[PDB]
Design a protein around this ligand. Structure first.
Ligand SMILES: Cc1ccc(-c2[nH]nc3c2[C@@H](c2ccccc2)N(c2ccc(O)cc2)C3=O)cc1
Ligand SMILES: Nc1nc2c(ncn2[C@@H]2O[C@H](COP(=O)(O)OP(=O)(O)O)[C@@H](O)[C@H]2O)c(=O)[nH]1
Ligand SMILES: [Mg+2]
Lengths: 67, 427
């Protein structure tokens, strides 16, 4: 009965720890995936605004080429 | 023949404190520990329950245990709260949340060793220690879970001393939480293995006695505990005063328990008195005998006519005719002899002690080992399986490391105990 008593309390400890651990890792996983995502949507927004500038060079280059 | 008393959790310490009030008044000890009595029967067996201190003071051999400080500050403030040895208040701060697993495995385990330290210091001052009596309920977490943890550890340290308990059974009529049937079933599993004698004190019966017989429309724990302390005083009369018998806990177990697991006693008391209001006609010996066998005077809500008496102890208190007591006791047997098992000859034993309890001239305490007690365990078993078949409320217990399996084992042990009682009621 003593060994059973220490197993039960070891199990409660082991379960509280595993819950804290998994919440800790679930969160760091979410915060990392969310940062990547937010950064990728911004980088794609800048990438195509910067294409607008390459096309604005191309258009000013034509007005001299044609004159 | 010293007895070591332990009281655990809210219920155990509330009925514990009343017990020491009642018997202290009987032995003529005051709330400061000084004896102010007239007779010497009061002091001949005072050491069964009291240690003697320098200054010729008397200090209960009582250890007060809780996982919460609440009730125990109440005891220490109560009338006789100062009589208790202060080193013997052993308490934590977290409480047990009416949760057997907290009392037995997590919170209680933190505190149990310091309780065993006090128990050890008490035992080592004993010429001839009989054993232990525990007051506790089975429905909360401390008295239930930690109380049965203590018993399991006391038996490991003192395997050859007697283990005696007063165990308050839960009832929906006086109910604190829905999980009482779980805590009580887990506790009965422990009691069946590790006690020699347990007085089953059914909050269901104390309620019905208060409501029907005492005409109290709204019973409180105060009304219930008045009944409990009168019973506790009655059943321990033979330990605390001298008789033709030199009575102790082991002789009681030897004569009351024909099979080791069947050690759950039905207590009864007569006359049934409400607190405060006294009545002025003493009962007659015929009346005591009839009431104390009346199901209405039983503290376990079980019908004795639905079972059979394996053994019976009867203790009459007051100035009365021993001839007439013998006559009335022989009359109740020979008139209803079918309710006594024929294969234990002469299974009824009666004692008389001169000193009555406070405020009565005549009283009778009944201790029955009846196969009808299975009704109590059936009741609790049905309430247990109603929830357990849906695993309801288990998370409170699995959160403390317990497995469903351990509930299945405890339920199944309690159902075996029921079947073992039915074996001998047909025998
Ligand atoms: C069928 C039967 C029942 C009991 C006994 C017997 N034999 N010795 C002792 C007993 C009990 C007892 C029961 C009633 C009257 C007087 C003694 N008892 C006792 C001990 C402590 C108590 O708190 C209360 C009672 C003894 O000490 C023999 C047969
Ligand atoms: N007769 C009686 N029963 C009580 C008393 N206090 C609590 N109980 C019962 O005990 C159960 C609660 O368990 P409790 O002992 O209070 O929890 P604990 O503090 O962990 O020991 C409830 O079902 C009540 O019916 C009391 O003063 N008298
Ligand atoms: Mg409570």
């Amino acid at each position: 009965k003593r060994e059973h008593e220490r197993e039960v309390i070891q199990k409660a400890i082991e379960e509280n720890n595993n819950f804290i651990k998994m919440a800790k890792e679930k969160l760091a996983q979410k915060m990392e995936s969310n940062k990547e995502n937010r950064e990728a949507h911004l980088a794609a927004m800048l990438e195509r605004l910067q294409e607008k500038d390459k096309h604005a060079e191309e258009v000013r280059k034509n007005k001299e080429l044609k004159e | 023949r010293e007895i070591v008393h332990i009281q655990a959790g809210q219920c155990g310490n509330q009925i514990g404190a009343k017990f020491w009030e009642v018997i202290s008044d009987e032995h003529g000890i005051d709330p400061t520990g000084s004896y102010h009595g007239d007779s010497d029967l009061q002091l001949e067996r005072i050491n069964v329950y009291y240690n003697e201190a320098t200054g010729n003071k008397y200090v209960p051999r009582a250890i007060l245990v809780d996982l919460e400080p609440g009730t125990m500050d109440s005891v220490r403030s109560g009338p006789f709260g100062q009589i208790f040895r202060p080193d013997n208040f052993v308490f934590g701060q977290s409480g047990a949340g009416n949760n057997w697993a907290k009392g037995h495995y997590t919170e209680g385990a933190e505190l149990v060793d310091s309780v065993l330290d006090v128990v050890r210091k008490e035992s080592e001052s004993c010429d001839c220690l009989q054993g232990f009596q525990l007051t506790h309920s089975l429905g909360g977490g401390t008295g239930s879970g930690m109380g049965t943890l203590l018993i399991s550890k006391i038996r490991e340290e003192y395997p050859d001393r007697i283990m005696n308990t007063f165990s308050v059974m839960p009832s929906p009529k006086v109910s604190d939480t829905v999980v009482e049937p779980y805590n009580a079933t887990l506790s009965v599993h422990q009691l069946v293995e590790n006690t020699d004698e347990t007085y089953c004190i059914d909050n269901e019966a104390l309620y019905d006695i208060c409501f029907r017989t005492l005409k109290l429309t709204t019973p409180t724990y105060g009304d219930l505990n008045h009944l409990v302390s009168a019973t506790m005083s009655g059943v321990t009369t033979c330990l605390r005063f001298p008789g033709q018998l030199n009575a102790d806990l082991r002789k009681l177990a030897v004569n009351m328990v024909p099979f080791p697991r069947l050690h759950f006693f039905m207590p009864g008391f007569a006359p049934l008195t409400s607190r405060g209001s006294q009545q002025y006609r003493a009962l007659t010996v015929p009346e005591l005998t009839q009431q104390m066998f009346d199901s209405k005077n039983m503290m376990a809500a079980c019908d004795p006519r639905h079972g059979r008496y394996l053994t019976v102890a009867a203790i009459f208190r007051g100035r009365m005719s021993m001839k007439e007591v013998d006559e009335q006791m022989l009359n109740v047997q020979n008139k209803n002899s079918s309710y006594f098992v024929e294969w234990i000859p002469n299974n009824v034993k009666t004692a008389v002690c001169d000193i009555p309890p406070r405020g009565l001239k005549m009283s009778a305490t009944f201790i029955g080992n009846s196969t009808a007690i299975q009704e109590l365990f059936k009741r609790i078993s049905e309430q247990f399986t109603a929830m357990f078949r849906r695993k309801a409320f288990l998370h409170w217990y699995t959160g403390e490391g317990m497995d469903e399996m351990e509930f299945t084992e405890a339920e199944s042990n309690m159902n075996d105990l029921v079947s073992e009682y039915q074996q001998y009621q047909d025998a």
